Write a protein that binds this ligand. Structure first.
Ligand code: ZR1
Ligand code: ZR1
Lengths: 318, 307, 303, 318
């Protein structure tokens, strides 16, 4: 919606971070002697109402280099805001493309593809798939911003959020489906039982054939206290360009960043954990031609049922 | 085309050259209506696998999972039926006749190795047991359940008749010696051991290949400072040393390749001629720089190793 | 009188094999649906593109025979829980392939092994196949009373077999099963094929399988003692366990090669014939076993 | 399943009809003088265990012409039966392809594409979509068998089948979903209130750009009796080649044909129809990139709710 994009726009830290990632890449790609010989093909993928397009222009001014911007967006309602901006302000500089980044046949290859297709659990908005289908129009030496991203997971206790999920039962569906789907939540009255550990990582471009975005990860979380496990908070980290990064992992949280809140992956039945015990969890990233989903299970101290088997409760559409 | 079968099953399991230069071939149909196996002798190694240009052939009642020469006339076969088979060439070497078919294992006999003397042999099965056989007496001398899973490889000592190496899906590499009351010992040193090769000169050094494509050099003495190389991408199905006084190590794999390595495990040869899984390697007794590989693609590819 | 089945890992000709198995007196055959040794590749070229058929044809048997006499067996090289990533990916594709092939034939049951502590990914792939399509096939977990690692010959010089009683330790195969069904959400389609080894464990270990969905018992030929006349028999301890299973009405499965001059089946029939007669109660309840009924309300309702 | 294919195979009438459609096309494409100069590229699309492949060979013998057969099947379990047949009997003649007919890159174009992708309501197994994605490998003058197919609809009364559908309520879903999905049924104790009328028709090849397989049809059915409408029986007709046809429309039913039974499209609330009244029904064929579905409503004598809006109760997967 228009207001969802307005909310994402009002996050200075994230855009001042994207600005710098483009700035440092512009310097690394075009030397001061080549300042006017080479104009860099910049392609914003999933442009929305164009906050990255503006950041790309702000990065081109401070890096004092020439850029050729393209603003690819599939949401045609957003595309109206872009085309009004292109006419009233941007001009010939920005070529607005109203397409799906995996269907667009581009005129020439890109020097830099810049995208914000990341959710609270990094690859949970299908950024791996989107940029894979866009990878064919990136120069055999082009830069993707972000270059890498990693999802993190930490075991939690909150009898208050476990109840909040129980209350999510709806009619005409599985009476237990509310426990087999992630939720975005600003976790507050809860307890983190072990330090966050990395779960899934994706790097762009992915030059490897049989690339495969499916995953299976086993995590072992040491617990020092006696407790009751109800779920797993998920966070993410991303490498925009070199040292420029964004994070929602609490121990490396980018100060003042608003666009993301933690995810929560609940479990049907709460699990007793004694002091000194290890909580072992298994996560999977699954997919078919049409849908991507997560499946997960606790294997220690005791087993749980496999949650969301075959995306039966929750899938993310392709 | 003698008094034998007219077709040889697509999946070529084993290639073995004897002393003169004649080539032994083991084959099984691992798909299709019938799941049986065959044994072939090619006095002309260049005529293989052509069924009409062979010296002798025979039909086994079940697939050939492994084989070894029992001298110059006999052939020892690891069967899917759970049988250990001994087939001997006739007086003219135009027939391959069954001598013994012994159903003593409770699952697919996966590996076979003839002991230094040649009067005894060791079989390793999916039934987890290892058995010591008397080829002449046609019986099992000892039955050993020392493993906790399927036996992948059994390799008799080059020179000692009481010593052999076994490896298994239970992650163990067992050094055996029938002269002890507890015959097996675990070689210390990761990934599951898949192939075993005794060094032909140092009767205390051997190599092992693992399910992760890595090949490793091991000395029984100080079982530390192990030398290793990532030779293959997929599991290592076999390791065979060249007849040279300073041998060359040929390694076959599921990645469909063959590589020939030196004493420091470095790569000197690489062959992608194969389109399916490489199942065996046999260096020519006559031309030591000429090595043969049979695959699951029905190819019998002859390689000239750059020495 | 006993529902018995032959377990094989070698079937060169399916019709000949079935004909001999039935001649022997078995009611069903457990056999591989693909060649146990025919390892397949699903990710890398050129073994990915292996041409020719992948197994024998479904045409080789009537639909009625696939439906009633053949029990499928998962291929022993399929390891969804391997520590090697490529082997898990390849094993996932091969397990779904093998399971979906048995569903295509309408086989009444398919066998899968439980022989290690970690069977997480195997369970996820089974759960996934259950939620895929329309099949209704029974899944049998081949789980041993005693793990192969705890009945091994004490012949490893530097790794000896402990003689200390590990109470919970000796019942490790039950936790392999318990974890697998907790992962698979207690599916009614997942049952036990309990494998009985050479020497029986502690009674407590056997009592762990009480109340569990045992649909079959696997008796290897190697657990049979020889009598004075030369035919296979079982120890009084082993016999006692058979009598427990007969009340549970399990399907007896004979695995392994022959070791005596069918007699293995005939002994079970003899034991089944010699069992005590059912008393008045046992005869009246014959059919009502573990069948949940509503408690009568003769005050509220009219009987 | 193997037994589903066995059941479809045991229908002689349908295969003796397909035989003749190929026979008459072989004669029309290769003149007696060209008998050995030209071998015709025949491509079975959705071959199953190969009953059409055999029919194509029987048609080539009686037409005394040369054919080059290809047996495209996506079901790899069926593909095992095909590859065993190819080895044991067919030979080099038949090139078995284990692919999805919309993904297969063919060596050369086809002279004739032959397919059986038809359900009880003709286009309800997605035959339009399947043969559209296969149309690029048909010669610019090739023949598709079938060349055309048409779905028919007739209003019915059966308080017995209306009850049978009511009994189809399942837990964890819409309590009324059983009324928003078709069923295959051998209609018996029922009454047909008006003669079947054509609904949707598809022709192959579809040489027209912006081809569009979506449909919207309005039918007006004259009723002579007083009654209660519960649903709509659906049937189909297909033109294999020229005068050779198959039909399940009762007034033109192909004698002895077993492979198809009528469909039934129910309505939530039964509708009273007086003698002389007209039952007006509206049908739609809908689709997105992933699913195809039907939506439908009665507009006379009274309106019903729109049934299955957005495939919410039943969609057919692409
Ligand atoms: C296949 C394909 N092809 C073309 N575009 C595609 C896709 C898939 C998605 N999208 C675009 C991406 C874009 O996502 C955002 C835009 C803004 C900005 F506009 F504010 C954001 F802040 C944030 C996001 C999303 N993560 C949180 C922050 C949204 O507009 C989608 O329509
Ligand atoms: C995109 C794509 N690519 C390749 N094949 C594809 C598809 C989509 C479907 N299919 C095939 C079609 C085939 O359908 C039949 C086969 C036989 C014969 F085998 F008996 C039949 F009698 C009948 C049907 C179906 N209508 C009733 C009669 C089935 O095998 C599917 O897998």
């Amino acid at each position: 919606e228009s207001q969802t994009y307005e909310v994402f726009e009002k996050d200075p830290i994230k855009y001042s971070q994207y600005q710098q990632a483009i700035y440092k890449c512009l310097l690394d790609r075009v030397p001061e002697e080549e300042k006017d010989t080479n104009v860099q093909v910049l392609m914003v993928l999933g442009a929305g109402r164009g906050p990255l397009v503006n950041a790309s222009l702000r990065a081109a001014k401070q890096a004092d280099r020439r850029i050729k911007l393209y603003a690819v967006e599939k949401n045609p309602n957003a595309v109206v805001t872009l085309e009004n901006w292109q006419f009233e302000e941007w001009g010939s500089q920005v070529t607005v493309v109203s397409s799906d980044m995996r269907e667009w046949v581009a005129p020439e290859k890109a020097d830099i593809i810049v995208s914000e297709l990341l959710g609270s659990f990094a690859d949970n908005e299908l950024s791996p798939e989107c940029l894979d289908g866009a990878q064919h129009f990136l120069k055999d030496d082009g830069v993707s911003i972000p270059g890498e991203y990693t999802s993190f997971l930490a075991p939690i206790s909150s009898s208050k959020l476990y109840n909040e999920v129980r209350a999510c039962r709806e009619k005409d569906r599985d009476p237990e489906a509310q426990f087999e789907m992630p939720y975005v939540v600003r976790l507050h009255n809860f307890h983190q039982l072990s330090a966050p550990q990395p779960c899934f990582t994706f790097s762009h471009p992915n030059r490897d054939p049989m690339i495969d975005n499916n995953r299976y990860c086993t995590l072992e979380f040491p617990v020092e206290v006696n407790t009751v496990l109800h779920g797993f908070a998920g966070y993410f980290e991303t490498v925009l360009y070199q040292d420029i990064t964004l994070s929602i992992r609490p121990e490396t949280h980018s100060p003042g960043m608003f666009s993301w809140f933690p995810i929560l992956f609940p479990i049907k039945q709460p699990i007793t954990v004694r002091e000194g015990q290890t909580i072992c969890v298994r996560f999977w990233r699954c997919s078919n031609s049409k849908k991507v989903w997560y499946e997960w299970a606790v294997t220690a101290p005791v087993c749980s049922a496999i949650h969301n088997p075959t995306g039966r409760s929750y899938t993310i559409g392709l | 085309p003698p008094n034998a079968p007219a077709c040889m099953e697509r999946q070529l399991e084993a290639a073995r050259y004897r002393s003169d230069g004649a080539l032994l071939l083991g084959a099984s149909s691992l798909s299709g209506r019938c799941w049986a196996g065959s044994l072939w002798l090619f006095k002309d190694p260049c005529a293989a696998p052509n069924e009409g240009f062979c010296s002798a052939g025979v039909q086994t009642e079940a697939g050939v999972a492994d084989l070894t020469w029992v001298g110059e006339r006999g052939i020892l076969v690891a069967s899917d039926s759970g049988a250990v088979e001994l087939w001997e060439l006739d007086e003219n070497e135009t027939l391959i006749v069954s001598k013994f078919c012994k159903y003593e294992h409770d699952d697919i006999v996966s590996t076979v190795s003839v002991l230094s003397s040649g009067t005894q042999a060791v079989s390793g099965s999916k039934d987890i047991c290892i058995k010591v056989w008397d080829l002449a007496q046609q019986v099992v001398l000892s039955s050993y359940r020392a493993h906790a899973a399927q036996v992948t490889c059994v390799a008799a000592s080059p020179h000692k008749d009481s010593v052999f190496l076994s490896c298994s899906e239970d992650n163990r590499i067992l050094l055996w010696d029938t002269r002890c009351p507890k015959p097996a010992s675990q070689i210390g040193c990761g990934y599951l051991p898949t192939s075993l090769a005794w060094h032909p000169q140092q009767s205390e050094v051997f190599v092992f290949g693992d399910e992760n494509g890595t090949v490793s050099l091991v000395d029984t003495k100080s079982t530390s400072c192990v030398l290793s190389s990532a030779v293959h991408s997929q599991c290592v199905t076999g390791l065979v040393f060249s007849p040279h006084s300073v041998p060359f190590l040929a390694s076959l794999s599921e990645d469909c390749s063959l590589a020939v390595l030196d004493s420091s495990l470095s790569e000197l040869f690489r062959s992608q001629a194969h389109r399916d899984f490489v199942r065996d390697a046999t260096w020519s007794p006559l031309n030591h720089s000429l090595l043969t590989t049979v695959g699951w693609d029905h190819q019998v590819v002859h390689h000239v190793v750059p020495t | 009188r006993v529902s018995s089945g032959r377990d094989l890992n070698c079937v060169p000709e399916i019709a000949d094999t079935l004909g001999a198995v039935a001649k022997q007196g078995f009611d069903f055959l457990c056999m591989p649906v693909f060649h146990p040794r025919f390892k397949r590749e699903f990710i890398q070229e050129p073994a990915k593109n292996r041409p020719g058929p992948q197994t024998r044809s479904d045409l080789l048997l009537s639909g009625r025979d696939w439906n009633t006499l053949i029990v499928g067996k998962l291929s022993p090289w399929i390891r969804p829980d391997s520590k090697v990533e490529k082997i898990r990916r390849n094993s996932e594709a091969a397990m779904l392939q093998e399971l979906n092939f048995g569903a295509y034939l309408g086989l009444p049951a398919f066998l899968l092994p439980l022989n290690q502590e970690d069977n997480t990914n195997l369970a996820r792939v089974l759960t996934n196949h259950i939620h895929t399509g329309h099949h209704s096939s029974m899944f049998w977990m081949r789980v041993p009373l005693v793990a192969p690692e705890d009945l091994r010959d004490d012949i490893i010089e530097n790794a000896p077999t402990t003689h200390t009683e590990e109470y919970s330790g000796e019942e490790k195969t039950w936790m392999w099963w318990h974890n697998f069904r907790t992962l698979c959400d207690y599916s009614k389609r997942i049952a036990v094929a309990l494998e009985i080894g050479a020497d029986l464990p502690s009674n407590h270990v056997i009592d762990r399988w009480l109340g569990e969905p045992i649909k079959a018992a696997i008796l290897p030929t190697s657990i049979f003692l020889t009598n004075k006349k030369g035919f296979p028999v079982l120890s009084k301890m082993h016999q006692r366990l058979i009598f427990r299973l007969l009340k549970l009405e399990v399907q007896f499965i004979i695995t392994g090669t022959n070791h005596h001059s069918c007699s293995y089946l005939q002994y079970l029939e003899y034991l089944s014939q010699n069992r005590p007669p059912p008393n008045a109660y046992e005869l009246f309840a014959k059919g009502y076993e573990d069948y949940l009924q509503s408690p009568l309300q003769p005050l509220m309702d009219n009987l």
